[model samples]
Target: ENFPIISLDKVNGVERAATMEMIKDACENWGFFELVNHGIPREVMDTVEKMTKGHYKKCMEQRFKELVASKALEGVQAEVTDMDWESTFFLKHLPISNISEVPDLDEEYREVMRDFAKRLEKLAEELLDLLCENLGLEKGYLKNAFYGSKGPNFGTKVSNYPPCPKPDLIKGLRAHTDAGGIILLFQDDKVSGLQLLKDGQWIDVPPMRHSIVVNLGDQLEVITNGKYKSVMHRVIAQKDGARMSLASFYNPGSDAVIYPAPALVQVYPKFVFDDYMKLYAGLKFQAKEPRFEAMKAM
Candidate 1:
């Protein structure tokens, strides 16, 4: 039930060494942790939250209501319990940004999101450098590995899970390990529902205001040669309130070639990131071990 809580503010102080060790242990053991005092300005995070929620109310709320109402929750009702009870839209940030192209984003919302993406990208690279330090790899090693011909694939999934009448019938999100490199999540503070599967139990990821939740993904597991794993996690729908999740994925570029680092090597197959994603799209909910084997075949 105990998960790691890290203070990024201490990373440059006298506590630096100890902080690094804490991060290493958290990566190896929990595969996820909460970061406090992370450099992103409180105001910026607040604006992102406010604008995101405002957009949802302005554009998505009624559509969600109609969607739910039109569905057959009435038939003595055996429905697809596996469906995710969330309204989501993706915004691409790297290679080429689609921020200006996304249909319903207000001008101010678009500008804020663009700024937010830049800050997150800088932070993501910084985090990778830290991971490089922890792994005894040279600085920029991990970041360079993620870079393809251009750079990493970066994007955000802005989602909201409205209050559910039958929470027991549907999950806010399905349980699966993320299929990318690293994920940074800015979730709701007052409403709670995210959980991680640990030791055969579902443990709550308690919401802390102004904190970032960092989690490793499948690509990281491969990069680390399984030293740090990508854990299974899910979100439960809440009857009390809707939960907002702004999840940003910093992944290897589509053309990037991924393989276990020479030092970490122990063994993982080399494959183009795009090919891996093609396979993943169809098998996202299934086990990941088979993907490595599939990559070997490729």
Candidate 2:
């Protein structure tokens, strides 16, 4: 449980360099952090909320109920001991555009989200520069390192977890670490269920209005040569209002090579994507330290 202390309000109405410094600390120490002035407008955020809610109403509300009644999630409930009542979907953005290919998206919602995702892509690239700046690498070092000939992969996950009566016995989302590069998450205004394990205490990330949570992942650690880190977090069950999460992932391609940065090497071993795959096999058996040690032994 490692979470850094950095407030968005602290750097609000400040300069870019200061925000960049805070973001750098977030990656290096916290491995995950939230941002307020992420360039996404309040109107745009409202649009996302309205459109997503409308879509769920038109398409998934009854379907989700049917699924819950069918008891198909019985095993999931028993295993996690937490019934995650949520309706979710994924949208891909890179390695060939495909948002238009998904079914059931309204033309308005589709177009709006496509533009939103584009803005996020630009924001993600800007974030890569900050990471590179703090790590003492070139401006696009991490981004370039993530590419495989064409470029890295980018995608979005839009999820909404409805209120549950027995929130004490269920989870909105299970404890897990995102297995990708950088992730920018836009959460709902109401419910306060997202929590991170900091030291020994479980701390809730303050549910501020229109805040975007930024987090690093395993790919980033590889790209920055372990200067930054990917963290593990989870979403607790909610008993009242619905919790919405829009998570955007910026990751490396499957065939892309991942390793430590050349500029700074802390006796780090070199490896490829396949090697990381093999390492993951053994990593699940132990803590994250063994995964880093496995990289060292590479």
lDDT of each: 0.83, 0.72
Candidate 1 residue 73 C-alpha distance from true site, Å: 20
Tell how far residue 195 is off in model 1, in angstroms. 1.1
Over 1-298, each residue of candidate 1 has an lDDT whose tens digit, in order, gives: 3678888989989999999988999899888988888899999999998998898776655555555665646533233453345679999999789999998889999999999999999888888999999998999998898999899999999988766557566644568898899999887664456678888778777667788889999888888889889999976656654378889999999899888888986477788888789776775437678768777898
Give a tens-digit lDDT track for model 2, residues 1-298.
Answer: 3344344444345565676677777777677776766678888888988998888776655565665666655643332233344678899888666789888989898888988888888878877886777788888877777787768788889887765556556534456666678888876675557776566556777656777778888877766667776767877646644377788888876567877777767544555554565566664537777669768998
- Specify the highest-TM-score model's number: 1
Question: What are the TM-scores, per candidate, against the unseen true structure?
Answer: 0.84, 0.78
In model 1, which residue pairs have backbone atoms overlapping below 3 Å? none
In model 1, what lDDT does residue 77 have? 29
